[PDB]
Design an enzyme around this catalytic site. Sequence first.
Site, PDB file in Angstrom:
ATOM      1  N   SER A  51       0.859  -1.167   0.000  1.00  0.00           N
ATOM      2  CA  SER A  51       0.000   0.000   0.000  1.00  0.00           C
ATOM      3  C   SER A  51       0.906   1.231   0.000  1.00  0.00           C
ATOM      4  O   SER A  51       2.098   1.121   0.292  1.00  0.00           O
ATOM      5  CB  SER A  51      -0.903  -0.005   1.241  1.00  0.00           C
ATOM      6  OG  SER A  51      -0.186   0.342   2.420  1.00  0.00           O
ATOM      7  N   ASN A  60      -3.795   6.296   3.446  1.00  0.00           N
ATOM      8  CA  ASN A  60      -3.517   4.999   2.843  1.00  0.00           C
ATOM      9  C   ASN A  60      -4.421   4.510   1.697  1.00  0.00           C
ATOM     10  O   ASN A  60      -5.665   4.544   1.774  1.00  0.00           O
ATOM     11  CB  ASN A  60      -3.451   3.964   3.971  1.00  0.00           C
ATOM     12  CG  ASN A  60      -2.787   2.677   3.550  1.00  0.00           C
ATOM     13  OD1 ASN A  60      -3.457   1.738   3.136  1.00  0.00           O
ATOM     14  ND2 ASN A  60      -1.464   2.614   3.682  1.00  0.00           N
TER      15      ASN A  60
END
Length: 130
Positions: A51, A60
């Site tokens: 990520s 995120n």
Amino acid sequence: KVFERCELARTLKRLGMDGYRGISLANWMCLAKWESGYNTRATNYNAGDRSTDYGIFQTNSRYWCNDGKTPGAVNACHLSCSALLQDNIADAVACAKRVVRDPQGIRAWVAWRNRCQNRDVRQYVQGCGV
């Protein structure tokens, strides 16, 4: 864009962040400071889970924005992660409001717990006229 402390403070206040979901402006300032150093183009790849963190609040890609390459990710802010890299922080702010609307609130960012929680955060907005 790399914001100057007080410039950011005034901007966030105008965007309605002061007291949003119980979170004082100084807490948001402490968070941005530790997450990106007030830098809107900051990105950080997390090799461990594939990520990436995007923007001034280091939001995120697994849960908040879509970048196409993060496995099993959702896009709760309904935004491309590119939107969180603009000099205009209107979208990054809208997405951070979405993040704290979840049960954890400001605690969703571990950096807040480490560097802001239970501390004297007044210094982040002192002298800024907000």
